[PDB]
Amino acid sequence: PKPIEADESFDDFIYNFASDDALQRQRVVFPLPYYNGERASKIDRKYWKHDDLFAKQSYYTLLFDREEDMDLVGDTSLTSVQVEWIFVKKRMVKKYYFERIKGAWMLEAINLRPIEENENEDFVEFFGHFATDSIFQSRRIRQPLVFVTTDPDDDFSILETTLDLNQWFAFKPALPADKLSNINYGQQNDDNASHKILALKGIGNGFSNILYFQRKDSGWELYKFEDTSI
Amino acid sequence: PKPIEADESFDDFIYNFASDDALQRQRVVFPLPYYNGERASKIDRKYWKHDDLFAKQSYYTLLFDREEDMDLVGDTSLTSVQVEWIFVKKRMVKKYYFERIKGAWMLEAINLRPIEENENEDFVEFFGHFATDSIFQSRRIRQPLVFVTTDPDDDFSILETTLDLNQWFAFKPALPADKLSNINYGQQNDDNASHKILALKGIGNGFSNILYFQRKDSGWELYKFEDTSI
């Protein structure tokens, strides 16, 4: 595999891997190890179907447990990154394993695993209900909701304010009901973590929203909302 | 604060407050309560920057739900009036709270925050698109458009005609793209209102245009254009 200009970073490569059919066929290891849990399978070159991943969407999602782990998105030293589909209602995670082989990003394996669960409310299952039921959503928002945005008088200036429930309904971004994406840049993904940070990032535009959730005894709740759009 | 001749009405005071720096410095309560929604702060004398408000503009705007509420502009019994900036594309508001303390108008507080309930939010989002996209604007004008002026020979009559889209483009006033003003004289500004009346008033001249919008199932549309200039 000859390294291209897209390989300089995972984020550049992944958009081209998903949007360019000819490039995708060169960057998939064949026979491709496919794991259906503990059941090992292999997908041969002839039966590969073009995977668009999240490239045709208006936005994609990223998940973190801690704010400082968002620093990892810009790490260009990464030689292994995974792309994930989290099937919210199916309790399944589909994961694509990418590796930079001699500066050239390759798909090495795909696996399917169940979402990990514990004694506390599961973030994934809570999120599915939060994203689709407005009444449940209204009961799972801290009041007032912390809102961080741009000062309308100066864009180089931060504005910290609050939103009431009616203002949240007017400002809230579109929320995925069926699937979440995630890119593993090495950020902690612990199912016992009491915080969950969902970044919503625009594809081919400056859209950027960050939703901070905290797990209370009563369950998960949205407590901080950032609009870092450019 | 010693009451002056301009304090007879809010409209006379506000032009003076914005155009005379020395007058402004004595009419602002210090430390000035400054809010960012439910977040509370203060602004001391040393960090106060002269605020021109809308005094340097050729015109300013007012918003109503019902025509008869425009009678409230001339209400001299008012002892508390608010001025606000509506940042159209950012859905942000800068509200200035004025109070007549012993016949002397004073700035009591400022709130820089996201737009709230009963602040014409739905109409304001539509208005930003109407004011900046000529194609969208042309699709959101009732055809034919009612065009009314006051009759200079008789106050009980009006001169009434209709305009086509080419005639509207030739007669239409300048429309603000980024920011609207509003002055709260006590007029209803309900979110469920199916009419929104935008008054464009001249600063230091008799210019007065009134744009009547109605919310159809298909959205807001301009249906009546009034020239009440004097």
Find all residues with CB under 8 Å of A101, minimum gap 6, and list them: A1
Residues in B touching A149 (Cβ below 8 Å): 90, 92, 114
Which residue(s) pair with A64 in the sheet? Answer: A197
CA–CA distance from B202 to each of B51, B85, B186, B213, B228 (Å)? 19, 17, 21, 20, 11
CB A208 within 8 A of CB A229: yes
Residues in A touching B124 (Cβ below 8 Å): none
Type of residue at A94: K
As to burial, measured by CB atoms within 10 angstroms (0-12 exposed, 13-18 middle, 19+ buried), residue B180 is buried
DSSP for A193-223 reads -SEEEEEEEESSS--EEEEEEEEETTEEEEE
Q: Say whether A147 and B37 touch across the interface (CB within 8 A).
A: yes
Q: Say whether B39 and A149 touch across the interface (CB within 8 A).
A: no
Residue A27: what are its φ and ψ, rounded to 5°? Answer: -105, 20
d(CA B6, CA B19): 12
d(CA B193, CA B124): 13
CB A85 within 8 A of CB A52: no
Q: Say whether B91 and A170 touch across the interface (CB within 8 A).
A: yes
Both tokens of A23, joined, read 């490039």
Q: Report DSSP state, residue A67.
A: G
Residue linked to tokens 């490569």 = A13
Both tokens of A225, joined, read 């909302």
d(CA B126, CA B132): 10
d(CA A208, CA A155): 15
Nearest to B38 among A144, A151, A166 (CB): A144
Q: Say whether A161 and B113 touch across the interface (CB within 8 A).
A: yes
Q: B32-36 and B104-114: which strand pairing?
A: parallel
Residues in A touching B91 (Cβ below 8 Å): 170-171
Please state how this structure was obtained: X-ray
d(CA B105, CA B10): 8
Among A155, A161, A164, most B C-beta atoms within 10 A, so best to mutate, is A161
- CB pairs A-B closer than 8 Å: 48
DSSP for B160-229 reads EEEE-HHHHHHHPPP--SSEEEEEESS----TT-SEEEEEEEESSS--EEEEEEEEETTEEEEEEEEE--
Residues in B touching A162 (Cβ below 8 Å): 36-39, 113
CB A100 within 8 A of CB A80: yes
Which residue(s) pair with B25 in the sheet? Answer: none
Domain count across chain A: 1
Resolution in units of Å = 2.2
Tell me how many helices (H) and strands (E) chain A has: 5, 12
Q: Say whether B114 and A150 touch across the interface (CB within 8 A).
A: no
As to burial, measured by CB atoms within 10 angstroms (0-12 exposed, 13-18 middle, 19+ buried), residue B37 is buried
List Cβ<8 Å contacts ≥24 apart for A38-44: A43/A110
Which residue(s) pair with B141 in the sheet? Answer: B222
Instruction: Give residue ranges of A with CB < 8 Å to any B CB.
Output: 144, 147, 149-153, 159-164, 166-167, 170-171
CA–CA distance from A112 to each of A86, A116, A125, A184, B117 (Å)? 10, 12, 17, 15, 46
As to burial, measured by CB atoms within 10 angstroms (0-12 exposed, 13-18 middle, 19+ buried), residue A163 is buried
CA-nearest residue of chain B to A229? Answer: B90
Q: Is B138 helix (H, G, I), strand (E, B) or coil?
A: helix
Q: Say whether A152 and B38 touch across the interface (CB within 8 A).
A: no
From the list A17, A20, A206, the residue with the least C-alpha distance to A108 is A17
Angle at B10 between CA B5 and CA B12, to 5 degrees: 50
Type of residue at B65: D
From the list A68, A179, A66, the residue with the least C-alpha distance to A115 is A179
Q: Say whether A152 and B36 touch across the interface (CB within 8 A).
A: no
Angle at B101 between CA B95 and CA B102, to 5 degrees: 160
Find all residues with CB under 8 Å of B14, minimum gap 6, and list them: B53, B55, B83, B98, B105, B183
Q: Say whether A151 and B112 touch across the interface (CB within 8 A).
A: yes
CB A171 within 8 A of CB A188: no
Find all residues with CB under 8 Å of A95, minimum gap 6, and list them: A82, A83, A84, A85, A110, A111, A112, A113
Rama region for A115: left / alpha / beta (φ>0; ψ in -120 to 50; rest): beta
Domain encompassing residue B106: 1-230
Q: Say whether A166 and B116 touch across the interface (CB within 8 A).
A: yes
Q: Which helix (H) or strand (E) holds B80?
A: strand B80-87
CB A187 within 8 A of CB A180: no
Among B90, B126, B178, most A C-beta atoms within 10 A, so best to mutate, is B90
Both tokens of A227, joined, read 């609009």
Nearest to B39 among A153, A160, A164 (CB): A160
CA–CA distance from B215 to each of B92, B99, B195, B210 (Å)? 22, 34, 6, 16
Among B34, B35, B38, B192, most A C-beta atoms within 10 A, so best to mutate, is B38
Biggest CA-to-CA distance, chain A: 58
Both tokens of A82, joined, read 């995974």
CB A179 within 8 A of CB A36: no
Find all residues with CB under 8 Å of A166, minimum gap 6, and list them: B116, B117
Number of Cβ within a 10 Å radius of residue A59: 19
Residues in B touching A158 (Cβ below 8 Å): none
CB B105 within 8 A of CB B27: yes
